Amino acid sequence: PLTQLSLPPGFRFYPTDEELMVQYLCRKAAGYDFSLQLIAEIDLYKFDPWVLPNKALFGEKEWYFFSPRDRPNRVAGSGYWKATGTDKIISTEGQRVGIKKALVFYIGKAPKGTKTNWIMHEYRLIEPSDDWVLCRIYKKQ
Amino acid sequence: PLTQLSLPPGFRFYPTDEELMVQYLCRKAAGYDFSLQLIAEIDLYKFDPWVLPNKALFGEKEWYFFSPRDPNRVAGSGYWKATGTDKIISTEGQRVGIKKALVFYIGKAPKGTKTNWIMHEYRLIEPSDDWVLCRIYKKQ
Amino acid sequence: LPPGFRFYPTDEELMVQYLCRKAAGYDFSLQLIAEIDLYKFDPWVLPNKALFGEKEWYFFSPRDRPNRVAGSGYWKATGTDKIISTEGQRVGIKKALVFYIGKAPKGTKTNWIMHEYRLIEPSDDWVLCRIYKKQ
Amino acid sequence: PLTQLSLPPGFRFYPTDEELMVQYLCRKAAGYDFSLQLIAEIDLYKFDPWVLPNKALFGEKEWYFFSPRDPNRVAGSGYWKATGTDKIISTEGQRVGIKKALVFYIGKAPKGTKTNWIMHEYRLIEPSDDWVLCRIYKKQ
DNA sequence: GTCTTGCGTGTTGGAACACGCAACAG
DNA sequence: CCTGTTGCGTGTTCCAACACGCAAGA
Ligand SMILES: [Au+]
Ligand SMILES: [Au+]
Ligand SMILES: [Au+]
Ligand SMILES: [Au+]
Ligand SMILES: [Au+]
Ligand SMILES: [Au+]
Ligand SMILES: [Au+]
Ligand SMILES: [Au+]
Ligand SMILES: [Au+]
Which CATH code is given to the segment(s) B15-138? 2.170.150.80
Angstroms from A59 CA to nearest CA on chain B:
12
Scanning A23-82 for CB atoms below 8 A from B yields 23-24, 34-36, 38
The integer distance in angstroms from the CA atom of B47 to the C1' atom of F2 is: 37
Q: Decide: helix, strand or coil at residue A127.
A: coil
CA Rg value for chain C: 15
Q: Which residues surround ligand 3, an ion (CB under 5 A)?
A: A 51
Under a CB-based contact definition with an 8 Å cutoff, are residues D121 and D132 in contact? yes
Give the CATH fold of the A3-139 domain.
2.170.150
- The β-bridge relationship of strands D62-68 and D40-41 is parallel
Resolution in A: 4.2
Q: How far apart are CA A136 and CA D26, in angstroms?
A: 55
- Give me the amino acid identity at B70: D
D127 touches chain C (CB under 8 A): no
Give the CATH superfamily of C11-133.
NAC domain (2.170.150.80)
Q: Decide: helix, strand or coil at residue C51.
A: coil
Candidates C18, C13, C37; CA nearest to C28 is: C18
Q: How far apart are CA A59 and CA B10, in angstroms?
A: 13
Q: How far apart are CA B91 and CA B97, in angstroms?
A: 9
Angstroms from A95 CA to nearest CA on chain B:
20
DSSP D18-63: HHIIIIIIHHHHHT-HHHHHHSEE--GGGS-GGGGGGGSSS-SSEE
Under a CB-based contact definition with an 8 Å cutoff, are residues D107 and D45 in contact? no
Q: How far apart are CA C53 and CA C47, in angstroms?
A: 8
Q: Which of C1, C5, C7, C30 to mutate to test the interface with D (most CBs of D within 10 A)?
A: C5
Chains in touch with B (≥3 Cβ pairs < 8 A): A
Q: Point out the nucleotide closest to B104 (alpha carbon to C1′).
A: E16
Strand E contact with A82 (CB < 7 A): yes
Dist. CA A92 → ligand 1 center (Å): 7
Per-residue DSSP letter, C63? P
- Give me the amino acid identity at B121: E
Relative to the alpha carbon of B22, which ligand is closest? 4
Distances (CA, A) of D11 to C9, C87, D8: 6, 20, 6
Q: What is the largest CA-CA distance in chain A?
A: 47
Chains in touch with D (≥3 Cβ pairs < 8 A): C
Buried-exposed string D14-32: b where 16+ CB fall within 10 A, e elsewhere: ebebebbbbbbbbbbeeee
Residues of C in Cβ contact (< 8 Å) with D13 = 4-6
User: Burial, D82: exposed, middle or buried (Cβ in 10 Å; 0-12, 13-18, 19+)?
Assistant: middle
